[PDB]
Amino acid sequence: ALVFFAEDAAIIGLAV
Amino acid sequence: ALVFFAEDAAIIGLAV
Amino acid sequence: ALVFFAEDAAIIGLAV
Amino acid sequence: ALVFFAEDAAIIGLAV
Amino acid sequence: ALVFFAEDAAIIGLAV
Amino acid sequence: ALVFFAEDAAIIGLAV
Amino acid sequence: ALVFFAEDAAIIGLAV
Amino acid sequence: ALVFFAEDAAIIGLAV
Amino acid sequence: ALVFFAEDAAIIGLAV
Amino acid sequence: ALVFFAEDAAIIGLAV
Amino acid sequence: ALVFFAEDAAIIGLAV
Amino acid sequence: ALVFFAEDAAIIGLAV
Ligand SMILES: [Cl-]
Ligand SMILES: [Cl-]
Ligand code: NA
Ligand code: NA
Structure with a gap:
């Protein structure tokens, strides 16, 4: 998954 | 509100 | 364009 | 965080 | 489905 | 425009 | 509602 | 920034 | 695909 | 239009 | 809630 | 990255 700050x-x- | 960079x-x- | 990290x-x- | 209803x-x- | 206001x-x- | 709460x-x- | 093209x-x- | 119509x-x- | 301007x-x- | 599942x-x- | 794959x-x- | 269908x-x- 991707973590956007x-x-x-x-x-x-x-988290996505 | 959240601030995305x-x-x-x-x-x-x-700004959201 | 914007680049989100x-x-x-x-x-x-x-890239967007 | 934001909460959309x-x-x-x-x-x-x-929740976001 | 979800209904956003x-x-x-x-x-x-x-509606979604 | 639309306003989401x-x-x-x-x-x-x-506001959008 | 807004309309995006x-x-x-x-x-x-x-339509949104 | 980007401007969507x-x-x-x-x-x-x-504007974004 | 859709192309947003x-x-x-x-x-x-x-392009999406 | 696209159809997401x-x-x-x-x-x-x-449908979008 | 919807579940996108x-x-x-x-x-x-x-999950949304 | 994520791939939505x-x-x-x-x-x-x-792709994202
Ligand atoms: Cl800024
Ligand atoms: Cl999830
Ligand atoms: Na506020
Ligand atoms: Na700056």
């Missing part, structure tokens, strides 16, 4: 602050990974 | 070069933030 | 491991660029 | 009847949250 | 005003459903 | 917490509108 | 050939509207 | 009528740009 | 300037076609 | 159980088509 | 190789289900 | 008729793969 994003700022939510903290950096999080969005 | 992308190369446009410079790094920019895409 | 994602962890696939190694970091890859997704 | 959707009727699946019943309301569910789609 | 949006304000178009009136609330509408987007 | 999501929980960001607080309920916010994403 | 895309080539499918002919250029058609995708 | 959509029919709202007017033809608008959705 | 966007202004990048020049109009570009994104 | 998804398990909704039965397998259905999502 | 995708090749990651193995076939996996993406 | 779709009917375009032949079945095609969308």
